[PDB]
Every structure is written in structure tokens, then in C-alpha cells.
Amino acid sequence: GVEKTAGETSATDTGKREKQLQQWKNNLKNDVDNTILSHEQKNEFKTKIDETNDSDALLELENQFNETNRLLHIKQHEEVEKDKKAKQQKTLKQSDTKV
């Protein structure tokens, strides 16, 4: 059928679906703000979530911030253990008997 039609290709649709998207966008930006993402990363995801009408790319943004947050919980845990169990460094004796 049609392709990338060079002209005045103006979509009169997406205005109704946007209402449904807005509630979903609020949900995603809430989770993004509740997660341990950096100040820049929170704003970074929120911007995309608002600008994206593409439901598939919104599903991708979920996969992205949940991944970023997961990577953060793993990285930051090791950095917490670094200070919390810094017994081979100038630190108090938090002798955390745990692995």
C-alpha cells in the first residue's frame, strides 16, 4: 500500500488514544521517580515517556528503566558492602558476619 508519503501527511488520529496513554505515562514516570535512578535518569526517562505515543516504545521504556534500576541495585549493593564491610580500610569494626 502506502509508504513514507512526501507531502502534507497529517495524522488526525491519536488524540483519543493519548488520553489512555496519559494514565499509563503517569504510572511509568511514578515508578521512574520511585526507583533509585539518578536525577538526570529520572528526567531522561520521563521525557521519553511523555513524548512517545508509540505503545511498543513505551513497553521498551519499561524494560529500560527496570533494567537500569536492577543494574543500580546490584552495583550500589557492592558499593554499600564496600564501606559497610571496609575492615581492611580505616573504618569502624562493622564485623558483618554474612556473605
Q: Any residues with CB less than 8 A from the CB of 17 and at least 6 apart, and which?
A: 53
Cα–Cα nearest to 65, from 45, 85, 83: 45
Cβ–Cβ under 8 Å, residues 42 and 33: yes
How does DSSP assign 9-57, residue by residue? -----SHHHHHHHHHHHHHHHHHHHHSS--HHHHHHHHHHHHH---HHH
Find the helix or strand (DSSP H, E) in which 88 lies.
Answer: none
Amino acid at 60: E
Burial 40-65 (b: 16+ CB within 10 A, else e): ebbebbbebbeebeeeeebeebbebb
What is the Cα–Cα distance from 25 to 43, expressed in whole angstroms?
A: 13
How many CB atoms lie under 10 A from the CB of residue 4? 5
Q: State the Cα–Cα distance between residues 42 and 24, nearest whole angstrom.
A: 16
Cβ 35 vs Cβ 69: under 8 Å = yes
